[PDB]
Design a binder for these strands. Structure first.
Ligand SMILES: [Mg+2]
Ligand SMILES: [Mg+2]
Ligand SMILES: [Mg+2]
Ligand SMILES: [Mg+2]
Ligand SMILES: [Mg+2]
Ligand SMILES: [Mg+2]
Ligand SMILES: [Mg+2]
Ligand SMILES: [Mg+2]
Ligand SMILES: [Mg+2]
Ligand SMILES: [Mg+2]
Ligand SMILES: [Mg+2]
Ligand SMILES: [Mg+2]
Ligand SMILES: [Mg+2]
Ligand SMILES: [Mg+2]
Ligand SMILES: [Mg+2]
Ligand SMILES: [Mg+2]
Ligand SMILES: [Mg+2]
Ligand SMILES: [Mg+2]
Ligand SMILES: [Mg+2]
Ligand SMILES: [Mg+2]
Ligand SMILES: [Mg+2]
Ligand SMILES: [Mg+2]
Ligand SMILES: [Mg+2]
Ligand SMILES: [Mg+2]
Ligand SMILES: [Mg+2]
Ligand SMILES: [Mg+2]
Ligand SMILES: [Mg+2]
Ligand SMILES: [Mg+2]
Ligand SMILES: [Mg+2]
Ligand SMILES: [Mg+2]
Ligand SMILES: [Mg+2]
Ligand SMILES: [Mg+2]
Ligand SMILES: [Mg+2]
Ligand SMILES: [Mg+2]
Ligand SMILES: [Mg+2]
Ligand SMILES: [Mg+2]
Ligand SMILES: [Mg+2]
Ligand SMILES: [Mg+2]
Ligand SMILES: [Mg+2]
Ligand SMILES: [Mg+2]
Ligand SMILES: [Mg+2]
Ligand SMILES: [Mg+2]
Ligand SMILES: [Mg+2]
Ligand SMILES: [Mg+2]
Ligand SMILES: [Mg+2]
Ligand SMILES: [Mg+2]
Ligand SMILES: [Mg+2]
Ligand SMILES: [Mg+2]
Ligand SMILES: [Mg+2]
Ligand SMILES: [Mg+2]
Ligand SMILES: [Mg+2]
Ligand SMILES: [Mg+2]
Ligand SMILES: [Mg+2]
Ligand SMILES: [Mg+2]
Ligand SMILES: [Mg+2]
Ligand SMILES: [Mg+2]
Ligand SMILES: [Mg+2]
Ligand SMILES: [Mg+2]
Ligand SMILES: [Mg+2]
Ligand SMILES: [Mg+2]
Ligand SMILES: [Mg+2]
Ligand SMILES: [Mg+2]
Ligand SMILES: [Mg+2]
Ligand SMILES: [Mg+2]
Ligand SMILES: [Mg+2]
Ligand SMILES: [Mg+2]
Ligand SMILES: [Mg+2]
Ligand SMILES: [Mg+2]
Ligand SMILES: [Mg+2]
Ligand SMILES: [Mg+2]
Ligand SMILES: [Mg+2]
Ligand SMILES: [Mg+2]
Ligand SMILES: [Mg+2]
Ligand SMILES: [Mg+2]
Ligand SMILES: [Mg+2]
Ligand SMILES: [Mg+2]
Ligand SMILES: [Mg+2]
Ligand SMILES: [Mg+2]
Ligand SMILES: [Mg+2]
Ligand SMILES: [Mg+2]
Ligand SMILES: [Mg+2]
Ligand SMILES: [Mg+2]
Ligand SMILES: [Mg+2]
Ligand SMILES: [Mg+2]
Ligand SMILES: [Mg+2]
Ligand SMILES: [Mg+2]
Ligand SMILES: [Mg+2]
Lengths: 200, 96
RNA sequence: UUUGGAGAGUUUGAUCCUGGCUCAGGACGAACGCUGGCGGCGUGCUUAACACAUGCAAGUCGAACGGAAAGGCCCUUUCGGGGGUACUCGAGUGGCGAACGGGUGAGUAACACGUGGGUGAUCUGCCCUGCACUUUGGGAUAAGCCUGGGAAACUGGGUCUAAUACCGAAUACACCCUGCUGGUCGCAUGGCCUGGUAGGGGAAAGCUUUUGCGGUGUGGGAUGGGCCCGCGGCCUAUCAGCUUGUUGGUGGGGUGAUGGCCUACCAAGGCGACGACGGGUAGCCGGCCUGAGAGGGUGACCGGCCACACUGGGACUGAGAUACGGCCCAGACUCCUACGGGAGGCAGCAGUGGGGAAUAUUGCACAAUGGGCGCAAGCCUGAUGCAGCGACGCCGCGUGAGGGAUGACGGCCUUCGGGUUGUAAACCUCUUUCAGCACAGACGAAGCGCAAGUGACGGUAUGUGCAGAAGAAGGACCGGCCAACUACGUGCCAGCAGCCGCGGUAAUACGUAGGGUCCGAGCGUUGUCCGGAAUUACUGGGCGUAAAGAGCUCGUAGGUGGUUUGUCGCGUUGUUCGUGAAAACUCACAGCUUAACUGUGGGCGUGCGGGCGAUACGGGCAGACUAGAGUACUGCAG
């Protein structure tokens, strides 16, 4: 089940853009509703939940899903925040988005669910697929002939490709090498709030 | 007369079987002396594993396998090694 | 040498402390209320261990015997049937299974459970394997035939038949017993070296002509058992004495094995304040939840044992019995009757009635695997594999989009300027997952057969095509705790509510609208358990006033000791081999497209057993001194 309602609601109510190209957010930054300008008392729990909901409604993950990422990240011996960031970025939807093959997380997820992608020559239609180190991502001819994929792959002038991701040619082959560090990932928001909120 | 049993574990839509040497009259999932191999045919290749040394020791001391166990350990090659007629042949197909 | 701890509201005019309550988190074998689409993977009577309509859940051998009731063939035929055939076989003898597999937690505080060894004190069919023999005689019965009682179950009387059914006798000299004579070991009788010695005793059955199985005994192994023990694990003195085969010895019987296991004779004690005997509760454990840990709660599923089979007892059989669908008897219930008498035990798989909040289908198969029979073929198996129902739970997926206005209806407020629902929507294009309609179509089976084939699942899972955004979202909250506010309607009424607490005409707390928040195929309520609760404080609390020093001494049992002068190492660490069943937890690997699921090998498996190596503290024991204490001499005040 995926949130079918408007996507601009999250940014408008919550106070930071998510897609990044929202003209409505910059037109009106205050939350919608008859009384979005009312003063609100500061609360550590408000801001802790705020970071959580920013993260979950930004990456489009399920609540149980994200809690499972939390406990997983906790139980790896590595640092909890970095482990959570990797275990969330390893979603094939976010990987193929940040590789430039999709215009947004929602569209990456929809295309993966419909199954336009091949993983190491094996059919994969699961938006929440797990990508480990040294994996190969392939795109089939039925999807190269697909018009929106062509638009994405010859309009891919979005945010630069990261260190661990890289494309090799026109076939849009996505390869992963190592575990990124938080500093070069430079993802917005702060995992400390989320980890502390679930530490509650 | 101790026989080579296959002990059922797990849940319903996937049967479980454990190649265990134990007394015959006990329960299907009864007391287990030693665990030597495990059997589960639901998977596509249905990979089979037996500890050859312990299997040979049990056959020598006098454990009597059931016909399916005999056939499976013949696929493994334990029966071939034990009887010595053809030798020790390995043909088991490994996972892709 | 590495991994992991949150608080907030609420007493007062005000705060500080203590102290109590409540809330935010996870989990359930859950339920009700609204809503609701599919597919995969689990789970399913926790109360009434209540009675149960019907059908299933335990059968196999002609290559054991006599035979041919029903099928086949061959001679016959009048189509009533008459002969052989062993292919086949009803019923009858004779074996094997039947103590296997499945179920429930009433009683049980116990060697009942886990761990640790044990047996010089046991036995063990079917399995495999080194090693003697399998001679002989006799009689009868079922079955069948005739007949009686009687609706029935069932039985008697007479005639008669064979066997691997039954019983003698011939060997045994390697065993099982009693009396006389050595070596080793200690852990004690005594065991072992089958010690030696004289006397006595001890068993078989054959079949098949083919991958051959049987009969009697125990030097060797393994499984299976039975028994004894150190240790452990609920509450309660508003439970202080308990016991008379009770305690101990000797002699007898007893049992596979020692034993007051049972009897007789002797003596009077054993257990008891380091909680006996009494009372209530309850199956135990690996595990599950919570907690950083300690700890607390608990025994879902699975698995290791325990105990039971309508209630209470008893015994036969067997290598093996609480003997669930074995036996006998007494009770209650139900049923049949021709009234003379008989049959029962779903806590087996399904199902019904009742209780409840409630928990499924009177489904398909031996395809795979375990179990029983048989030389095999083969047979049986509600064990098991599978399917059907149910958002009850861990897990994945679907109800779309890209762009689109200083933002079209309509609703709600307005300060009447306007703002709201809103990139939402109508729109132009896209792929259309999964359902829908078709084709192909598995593996699960180096399996079994000397046959020609064998898959319930399933013609599903899975691939290949067709049409269409076409078939797909709701539930709680929005006074503070606690992310979410305004208007409309009644005002100490109607009502909310987990703590404070909210309405006495203009409520962000009641009801309705919008608007926003949380969650989502689930959403809340309710109940149980942990945490915060350091709120039972060992880690980790106090006793002046909040709860607490008993009124104070003497002092028994217990707990604890002022120096240094000496062994054994029983408090203890000093290292190593030696257990820690499986499963679960944690680490890494690998497979089902990833998802639950499971496929392999590690690792984990935090306790306890014996052999070898240490002596600083923490005790008894084997000897001396005095800084605590007491005495001794002189005075002292009260
Ligand atoms: Mg927490
Ligand atoms: Mg059993
Ligand atoms: Mg195979
Ligand atoms: Mg067979
Ligand atoms: Mg850790
Ligand atoms: Mg108050
Ligand atoms: Mg007060
Ligand atoms: Mg006050
Ligand atoms: Mg389903
Ligand atoms: Mg099911
Ligand atoms: Mg019946
Ligand atoms: Mg038979
Ligand atoms: Mg017959
Ligand atoms: Mg038997
Ligand atoms: Mg029986
Ligand atoms: Mg039985
Ligand atoms: Mg059960
Ligand atoms: Mg039950
Ligand atoms: Mg019980
Ligand atoms: Mg007791
Ligand atoms: Mg036997
Ligand atoms: Mg003879
Ligand atoms: Mg007769
Ligand atoms: Mg004769
Ligand atoms: Mg004789
Ligand atoms: Mg003789
Ligand atoms: Mg003699
Ligand atoms: Mg001799
Ligand atoms: Mg005989
Ligand atoms: Mg025989
Ligand atoms: Mg013991
Ligand atoms: Mg113990
Ligand atoms: Mg005696
Ligand atoms: Mg004696
Ligand atoms: Mg006795
Ligand atoms: Mg006596
Ligand atoms: Mg434990
Ligand atoms: Mg803790
Ligand atoms: Mg604790
Ligand atoms: Mg327990
Ligand atoms: Mg079990
Ligand atoms: Mg035991
Ligand atoms: Mg009984
Ligand atoms: Mg009884
Ligand atoms: Mg009984
Ligand atoms: Mg029964
Ligand atoms: Mg029965
Ligand atoms: Mg009964
Ligand atoms: Mg049943
Ligand atoms: Mg009822
Ligand atoms: Mg149910
Ligand atoms: Mg079978
Ligand atoms: Mg054959
Ligand atoms: Mg049958
Ligand atoms: Mg049958
Ligand atoms: Mg099933
Ligand atoms: Mg329901
Ligand atoms: Mg329903
Ligand atoms: Mg899902
Ligand atoms: Mg669009
Ligand atoms: Mg399809
Ligand atoms: Mg096949
Ligand atoms: Mg084949
Ligand atoms: Mg597929
Ligand atoms: Mg609020
Ligand atoms: Mg709030
Ligand atoms: Mg009002
Ligand atoms: Mg709303
Ligand atoms: Mg609690
Ligand atoms: Mg202390
Ligand atoms: Mg305390
Ligand atoms: Mg006081
Ligand atoms: Mg006092
Ligand atoms: Mg007093
Ligand atoms: Mg003393
Ligand atoms: Mg020592
Ligand atoms: Mg040692
Ligand atoms: Mg050890
Ligand atoms: Mg193991
Ligand atoms: Mg853990
Ligand atoms: Mg793989
Ligand atoms: Mg493991
Ligand atoms: Mg522990
Ligand atoms: Mg002392
Ligand atoms: Mg002196
Ligand atoms: Mg002195
Ligand atoms: Mg004086």
């Amino acid at each position: 089940a995926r949130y079918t309602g408007p996507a601009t609601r999250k940014s408008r109510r919550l106070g930071v853009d998510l897609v990044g190209g929202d003209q409505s957010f910059e037109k009106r930054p205050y939350p919608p509703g008859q009384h979005g300008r009312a003063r609100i008392k500061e609360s550590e729990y408000r801001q802790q939940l705020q970071e959580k909901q920013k993260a979950r409604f930004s990456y489009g993950v399920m609540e149980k899903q994200f809690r499972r990422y939390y406990e997983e990240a906790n139980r790896q011996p590595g640092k909890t925040g970095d482990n959570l960031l990797r275990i969330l970025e390893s979603r094939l939807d976010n990987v193929v988005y940040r590789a430039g093959l999709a215009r947004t997380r929602r569209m990456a997820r929809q295309l993966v669910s419909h199954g336009h992608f091949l993983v190491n020559g094996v059919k994969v239609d699961i938006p929440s697929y797990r990508v480990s180190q040294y994996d190969i991502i392939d795109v089939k001819e039925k999807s190269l002939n697909t018009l929106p994929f062509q638009i994405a792959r010859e309009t891919a002038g979005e945010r630069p490709i990261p260190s661990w991701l890289q494309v090799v040619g026109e076939r849009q082959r996505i390869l992963v090498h190592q575990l990124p560090e938080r500093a070069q990932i430079d993802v917005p928001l702060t995992e400390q709030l989320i980890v502390e909120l679930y530490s509650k | 007369a101790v026989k080579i049993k296959l002990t059922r574990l797990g849940k319903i839509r996937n049967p479980q079987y454990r190649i265990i040497v134990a007394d015959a009259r006990t329960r299907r999932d009864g007391r287990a002396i030693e665990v030597i191999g495990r059997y589960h045919p639901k998977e596509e290749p249905s990979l089979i594993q037996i500890d050859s040394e312990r299997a040979q020791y049990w056959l020598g001391v006098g454990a009597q396998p059931t016909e399916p166990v005999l056939a499976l350990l013949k696929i493994t090659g334990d029966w071939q090694k034990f009887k010595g007629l053809p030798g020790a042949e390995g043909t088991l197909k490994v996972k892709e």
